Write a protein that holds these residues in place. Structure first.
Motif, PDB file in Angstrom:
ATOM      1  N   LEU B   7       0.830  -1.204   0.000  1.00 18.55           N
ATOM      2  CA  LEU B   7       0.000   0.000   0.000  1.00 18.55           C
ATOM      3  C   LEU B   7       0.861   1.249   0.000  1.00 18.55           C
ATOM      4  O   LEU B   7       0.551   2.224  -0.694  1.00 18.55           O
ATOM      5  N   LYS B  10       2.099   1.605  -3.528  1.00 19.68           N
ATOM      6  CA  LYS B  10       1.048   2.064  -4.424  1.00 19.68           C
ATOM      7  C   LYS B  10       0.549   3.460  -4.094  1.00 19.68           C
ATOM      8  O   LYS B  10      -0.248   4.011  -4.854  1.00 19.68           O
ATOM      9  N   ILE B  11       0.924   4.014  -2.948  1.00 12.49           N
ATOM     10  CA  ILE B  11       0.730   5.443  -2.743  1.00 12.49           C
ATOM     11  C   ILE B  11       1.963   6.206  -3.186  1.00 12.49           C
ATOM     12  O   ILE B  11       1.902   7.058  -4.079  1.00 12.49           O
ATOM     13  N   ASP B  49      -5.739   2.859   1.722  1.00 13.42           N
ATOM     14  CA  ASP B  49      -6.416   2.263   0.580  1.00 13.42           C
ATOM     15  C   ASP B  49      -7.000   3.328  -0.333  1.00 13.42           C
ATOM     16  O   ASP B  49      -6.793   3.281  -1.548  1.00 13.42           O
ATOM     17  N   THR B  52      -4.129   4.852  -2.157  1.00 15.58           N
ATOM     18  CA  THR B  52      -3.714   4.025  -3.284  1.00 15.58           C
ATOM     19  C   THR B  52      -4.659   4.191  -4.459  1.00 15.58           C
ATOM     20  O   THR B  52      -4.222   4.345  -5.603  1.00 15.58           O
TER      21      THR B  52
END
Lengths: 532, 532, 532
Positions: B7, B10-11, B49, B52
Motif C-alpha cells: 500500500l 502504491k501510494i 487504501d 492508493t
C-alpha cells in the motif's frame, strides 16, 4: 492438538483457486502457534473454517425445461398462475440468454405482495425446477455493510457477511438465494447496505463482491438471486435497477381453502401426526377465516390449523375412537377459543351518518366510513379525521354538485348557507388522501342532508365531476380483493373502468356482483331507499 | 503486513502532493503501533487504501472533431437539431479556451427537461465523441456535506462522498462527468451543500478540493463536468447564478416511431438474445403510442417494447417454427392487454360546462379539465381546485369580458348578480406561471352558462383582455408538444404568435389545425358545439 | 487522538481574544472524552471549527485616495462620471473619518437602481480602488435572523448566519461586502432582520455584534459595507437610516453601444477566444439593441453577444476564410434568433377604451396599457391588479372629475349609478407609491366612457388631484429614459415638472415632445385622437 495438520489438509483438499490458495497460505502464516485462544490463531482458524466450507468452483447442473418448470408451476399453490407467466417470461430470457454478456444487467423479478403468502414456495419451485439450491438469508432491517460484508479480522469478533453465512451453507456455486425484507433496510451508522446490495446486484462485481472479513473476492456467477419485499414505494431507486416488480395478489377465501386442503391441511395432519383422523369440513374453514384470522397470507389461518392439529392430536393421545372426527363449524370454538372477529361487518343496521367504501394498504385492505354532522347554523365545511385537501376539494365538488342538484334529489335549495357541515373521516387519517372515495363522500353528504339511512353492504370508490361523473380510477384489483375479503356483494365500480373490468380472473366477479356506475344519480338510489 | 508495505508502494509511487506523503506517513505512524490494534488501525489502512486507489496524474483523450461529433450527435436518441446546436457551441467555446485560459470560466449548461428524452444517452453520445470516461452520480435529495464529504479521518465509520467514490471508481483524473438531478438536490437540514455545488461548478474552487475524510487539495479543474435536470422552478437562484439553462422540448410521435424503428426494438432484440428472429410492424408502434402510455417521452413505450420482446422470447421458446417471428398491430393487444387508451381523442362527447386547457411543466404536458358550477345563489365567484389569485385575475377578467356581452352570446342579463360561480382547475396553481390558459376558463364559463356542449379535440390556452383580446403566451412550442403528445391536431393559436409559430420544425406542425385567433368570440364560435 | 492534537492546538496557534480563548478551552475541557460515537461532540467539533477558523483582526491595506481611486472609477460603464463624485464624497467621509474609525452617523450608501448594470462592477472597481478583498452577499426572500446571527446552539446542528459564515469565508476585517437584495426583508420566520442589520450597522455595536451559535459577540469595526437595493420606498425605517440612495440612469443605445464597443463586445471577443476575429458593424449592434432585448439592464445585451460569439466561433471552426470577419446587419437573424422586438413599437392601432402610460418598477421604469371594462351593472368601481388604495382614490378623483364633467367631453350619467367600472393595472403596489400614473388611468376611464379612440406613442403618468388637477411627482425621469429607449415621442407632464426636465438630457428630449400641462380636461384632449 492436531489443528495445524487438519487445516493444512483442509487447504490441500478443499478446492481453491490460486489467489485463494495464497490467502490460505496467509492464514497459515497466522497459524503455527502452540495454543488455542490467541485471536490471531482463532480468527485465522475460523477464517479457514469459513473458507473451506464456502465452496469454490463447485456447482450442480441445471435441468432447464421451462415447461417442467411450468409443471413445477402447477405445484406449491393452487394460485391464479397470473404472474407465474411473468416468471416464465424472465426464465425465457434466461433460457435464451445463456452464457452471453450480450445480455448484461438482467433484472431478476423482485417480489412484493401481502405477507404470509408463499414466496418460499415459489423460490423452491424455481430451485427444484432448475435442480438448484434454495436458501434464505434475511437481509432487511439492516443499516450496515459490516452486517452485509465482513466484520474485521483486525477486530475481535471477525464476522463475514450474512451472504457468507449463506454460502458456507451452500455447497454449489449455482444456488438460488431468496432475499428478504428488501424494502426494509436503513442506514444510520457505519455505511449503507444498499450499495453492497447493488454490487451483488451488479452481475459482474458480485463475482468480485468482497467483504471486510475476506481477502480474495468470491464468484457469484451462477448463483441466481431472487428478492422479496411486501410494500412498494419504499424501494431504493439505485436498487430499482436490475429488479422487476412482481406483485402478489392476495388469496381469496376459496383460493385459500384450495391452497389449504390441496397443500396445507395435509401438512397440518402430519404436524398433528394424524393419518387423517379429523375430517375438516370447509365451511368450517370459512368460519376459521370469518372469526379468527385477518390476513391475505396463510399465517394465522395455519396457526388455527396447527391449533386444531395439536388439540385433536392430544385428544387422540387421550384415547383413540375414530379416523372420522368430522370437524364442523360448531366445534371450532372448542378448538379455537373465543371468536376473534364478528361473523358480520357489512351488518351496520343502516343509518344516516354512514359511509362504506373501499381502500387498501400494501399489506391489507380497509373500508371507509364517514360522519357528517349537519347542524343548523350558517353553512360551512369542516375537515376532521386528518383529512387531506384532495379530500376537501373532492367533497366540495360533490357538495356543489348537490348545490346544483338539490330538488333533483328532494333537497331544499339553500342548504349551503344555513347548516354547517362537520366531516369526520377517521380513515382520512389513513394516509391515502387521494381521490379514491369522492362518491363515498357524496353519499355520506347526501345521507346527512337527507337525514336518512345510508345503507349497508354497498361499497363504492372512485372520482367524480362537478356536473357529476364517475372518472376512471386504478388499483381496482386489490380493492376487489379486499371487498371479497370484506364479503361485500353489491360493489359500485366505474362504468369507465369497465374496460378494466374484464381484465381480471373471473372468479372474483362471480363472487362479487358489480353495480357499475357512470352516473352519480345511480348510486343515489343505492344507499337510500329513503332518498327523501 | 507486506500488503500494507505494498500500500505504501502504491501510494508513494503514485504522483502525489507531499501533503499526501506527509499525511500517509503519519498514517504509517498510526500503522506502526495499531497493527491488529484499535480502529486507528482500521481507518488508517482504509485511508491508505483510498490513497492508493484514488487516481492521480492520469489522462484520457478529448474531443477534437466537431462534425464527427455531429455524426455522433445524429447517432443519438434522434437527430433533433435543436440542442446539439448548443452542444457544438459549448465545444467550440471550450476549444478556443483550450490553451487553458481564464476564459474557461463559464456555466456548464444544465440539460433541464422532461423524462423520456434519454438523458443519459446525451452524455453517452458525448463520451462516444469525447472518447472520455463517462460517469454518473444521481444527485437527488442531497442535504449534507456529510453526504458530500467525510467528517472523520480517525475512527472508521465515516467515509468520503459519492464524488470521491466516483473518483475511486475511475483510474483517471479526467473523466466525462454527467451530473444528474441538480434540481433534485434538497436543502433540508442545516449543512446543505449548495455552495459545494458552486465548488463543483467553480473550476479553481475544486482544483484545490478535499473531504473531511481524505485531506489534500485534489484536482477537479482537469475534470470536465456537465449537469442535467428536469424543471427550472426549484433550482436555487445562486445555483441558477453562474448557470445558463438548456431547455429540452419533447418529441413527436412519428419521431418517436423513428426512434423506435431505427433504434429501440433492435436494442430490445439485443437484450432479448433474439438477433434475427423478431419482426414488428410500424403502425403497431403507432397503436402502441396512441393507446397505451400517455407519458411524455419514450420510457413506458420502451418498456412495452421490452415487454413484447420478452413475449416473443416466450413464444419463440414454444418451439422454432421460423427463423423470423413476425408481428402486426393486431396481437399487441395480446401482447399488452386491453387498450389503455384510444388513438387521438376526438370522441370525448362535447361538454355543457367543461373545457380543456394546455399545460407543460418540464416533466410533461397535458390538458386541464376545467369546470364551473353555475349554482344559482347570490351571484359571486369561487376559485375551486384550491387556487391562487392568478386564477382570480384570469377568470374574473375573462368573466368581465363575458359580462361585456350579456346578450351577445345568447345569455340573459345577470349571472354574476344572480348565480354563484364556482370555477375549478384540476391543479392548484398555474403551470406556466400566471395566466396562460384564461380562454379555457372563459370557455368553460360560456359552456356552463349556456349549458351548450363544448367542442372536444380543439384545445385552447392563452391570455385575455377586458376587451376580449388575445395576449401572447410564449413557449408555445411546448403547448404544441402538449397537444401532439395528447395527439391534438386542432389547436387554437394566437394571431399574435403566428410569427412565433413560424419558428418550428414542420414535423411539429404536421397537419395541425391552427386557428389563428386574436379575439375571443372567434373561439366562442370555435369551441362550443353550437355557436351558442 | 490525531483529531485531538489538530483541533486542540487551534486554540493556541490562532490568536483568540481572552473570552474567546476562554470559552475555546472550555470547549476543550467539556470535551476530551470519547468524541467519535456521539453527535454532541461532532457538533462541538464544528463549534470549534467556527471559532478556530474565523479571522481575528487581520485586514487589508487601508489606503483612502480620491484621485487614483477616481482613475479606477474611470473604468465604469460608459464613463458616467457623476456618481463617482458620490464615491469620492464617501471617500471624503473616509477622509473626514476621525471621530469614528469608520464613519457612520453618516450616509453609508444604499444603492437603488437597475440591478447589475455594473453596480457589482462598481464594487469591483471599489475593491480595486481600495485594494480590498471583495465579496457579494444577497438577500432575496430572506426573513430569518439565523441566516444573520448564529442559530440557537440549544438546537443541535445550529449554524452561524450567512454573513457570519461569509466572514468565515473571507478573512479580513476590512473587506468590501456588497449588500444585495436587502429590500426583501420581513418578519415571517423569527423576526425582521432589518433590525439585525440595524445592529450590524450600528457603529458602536458592530464591534460586539452578538451571535448565538458562537455566543461571543463578533467584531466589526472596519468591514467596508456597501448597501444595494432595487426599492427605495419599501425600505423599513432603521435600514432607511445612515445611508442615501445613489442611482445610475439608463444608458442610451449609443451609450450602451459604447459600453459594448469600449468594453463589453471586446470582452466577448476575448471570451470567445476570437481575439480580433470578429468584427460586427455597429448598426447591427444598435439593431440588436432595438430588436432582441428590452432591458434597463445591460448584461442580457452581452448575453446576446455571447450567443453571437458562440455562433461565430462555431462558424470559424466550421470554416476559416478569415481570422477577422465582418458581421453586418444581415446575419443578425442568422447569428441570433428572429428579431424578438420590432425596433419600432408604435404600431399598436390606437386604442379606444384602454390607455398606455408609464410605470415604475424596482428595475426602473416602463410602459403599460392599463385596461378598463366599463361594464353595465350597479354602478361600481373595481381596480384589479391587486392595487393600492392610492390607485383607487386617484380613480375616485377621476370619477369626481367626470361627475363634474359629464356633458363636457361627452359621457354617460352612470359610471357610478348603473355602470360598474372594472380597472386593471398590470402591476400592483408600485415602488413609486401613490398615483404614479393616475392620469393614464383617467384616460383609460374616459376612453371606455366617452368611447373615443385614444392614441399610442403618447406616454403619460402622474397624480389626479381631487381639485380636478394634476399634481407632479418625482421619478418620472427614468420612465422618460424608458420611453426614450422605447422610442416614444409625445409626453404629457404637469407644469411643475418643467424644472424636472433640467437634470434630464435634451437629447433624451428631442424625440420626446413634451406637453407640460396639469389640467385634466387638457390631458383628456392630448391623448385621444379626437380630443373631446
Amino acid at each position: 492438538l492436531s489443528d495445524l495438520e487438519a487445516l493444512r489438509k483442509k487447504i490441500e483438499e478443499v478446492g481453491m483457486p490460486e489467489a485463494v490458495k495464497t490467502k490460505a497460505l496467509k492464514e497459515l502464516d497466522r497459524l503455527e502457534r502452540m495454543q488455542q485462544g490467541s485471536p490471531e490463531a482463532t480468527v485465522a482458524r475460523t477464517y479457514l473454517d469459513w473458507l473451506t466450507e464456502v465452496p469454490w468452483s463447485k456447482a450442480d447442473p441445471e435441468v432447464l425445461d421451462i415447461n417442467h418448470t411450468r409443471q413445477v408451476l402447477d405445484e406449491d399453490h393452487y394460485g391464479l398462475k397470473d404472474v407465474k407467466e411473468r416468471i416464465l417470461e424472465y426464465l425465457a430470457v434466461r433460457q435464451l440468454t445463456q452464457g452471453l454478456d450480450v445480455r448484461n444487467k438482467a433484472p431478476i423479478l423482485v417480489l412484493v405482495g401481502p405477507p404470509g403468502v408463499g414466496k418460499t414456495s415459489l423460490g423452491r419451485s424455481i430451485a427444484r425446477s432448475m435442480n438448484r439450491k434454495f436458501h434464505r438469508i434475511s437481509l432487511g432491517g439492516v443499516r450496515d455493510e459490516a452486517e452485509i460484508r465482513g466484520h474485521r479480522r483486525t477486530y475481535i469478533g471477525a464476522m463475514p457477511g450474512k451472504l457468507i453465512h449463506a454460502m458456507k451453507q451452500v455447497g454449489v456455486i449455482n444456488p438460488v438465494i431468496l432475499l428478504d425484507e428488501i424494502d426494509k433496510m436503513s442506514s444510520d451508522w457505519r455505511g449503507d447496505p444498499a450499495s453492497a446490495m447493488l454490487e451483488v446486484l451488479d452481475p459482474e462485481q458480485n463475482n468480485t463482491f468482497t467483504d471486510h472479513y475476506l481477502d480474495v473476492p468470491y464468484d457469484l456467477s451462477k448463483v441466481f438471486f431472487i428478492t422479496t419485499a411486501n410494500t412498494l414505494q419504499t424501494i431504493p431507486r439505485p436498487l430499482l435497477d436490475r429488479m422487476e416488480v412482481i406483485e402478489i395478489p392476495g388469496y381469496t377465501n376459496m383460493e385459500k381453502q384450495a391452497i389449504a386442503r390441496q397443500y396445507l391441511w395435509p401438512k397440518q395432519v402430519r404436524e398433528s401426526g394424524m393419518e387423517g383422523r379429523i375430517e375438516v369440513t370447509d365451511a368450517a374453514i370459512l368460519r376459521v377465516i370469518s372469526e379468527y384470522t385477518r390476513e391475505a397470507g396463510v399465517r394465522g389461518l395455519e396457526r388455527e390449523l396447527g391449533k386444531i392439529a395439536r388439540k385433536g392430536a392430544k385428544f387422540w393421545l387421550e384415547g383413540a375412537w375414530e379416523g372420522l372426527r368430522t370437524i364442523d363449524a360448531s366445534d371450532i370454538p372448542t378448538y379455537l377459543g373465543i371468536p376473534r372477529y364478528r361473523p358480520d361487518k357489512a351488518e351496520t343496521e343502516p343509518q344516516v351518518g354512514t359511509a362504506q367504501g373501499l381502500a387498501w394498504t400494501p399489506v391489507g385492505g380497509t373500508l371507509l366510513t364517514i360522519e357528517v354532522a349537519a347542524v343548523p347554523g350558517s353553512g360551512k365545511l369542516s375537515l376532521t379525521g386528518q383529512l387531506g385537501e384532495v379530500m376537501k376539494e373532492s367533497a366540495q365538488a360533490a357538495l356543489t354538485y348537490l348545490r346544483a342538484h338539490t330538488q333533483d334529489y328532494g333537497l331544499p335549495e339553500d342548504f349551503y348557507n344555513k347548516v354547517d357541515l362537520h366531516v369526520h373521516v377517521p380513515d382520512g387519517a389513513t394516509p391515502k388522501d387521494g381521490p379514491s372515495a369522492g362518491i363515498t363522500m357524496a353519499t355520506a353528504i347526501a345521507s346527512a342532508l337527507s337525514r336518512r339511512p345510508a345503507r349497508m353492504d354497498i361499497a363504492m370508490t372512485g372520482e367524480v365531476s362537478l356536473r357529476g361523473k364517475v372518472m376512471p380510477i386504478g388499483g381496482v384489483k386489490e380493492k376487489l380483493l379486499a371487498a371479497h375479503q370484506a364479503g361485500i356483494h353489491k360493489i359500485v365500480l366505474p362504468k369507465d373502468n369497465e374496460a378494466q373490468l374484464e381484465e381480471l380472473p373471473k372468479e372474483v366477479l362471480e363472487g362479487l356482483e358489480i353495480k357499475l356506475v357512470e352516473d352519480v344519480g345511480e348510486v343515489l338510489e343505492y344507499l337510500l331507499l329513503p332518498e327523501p
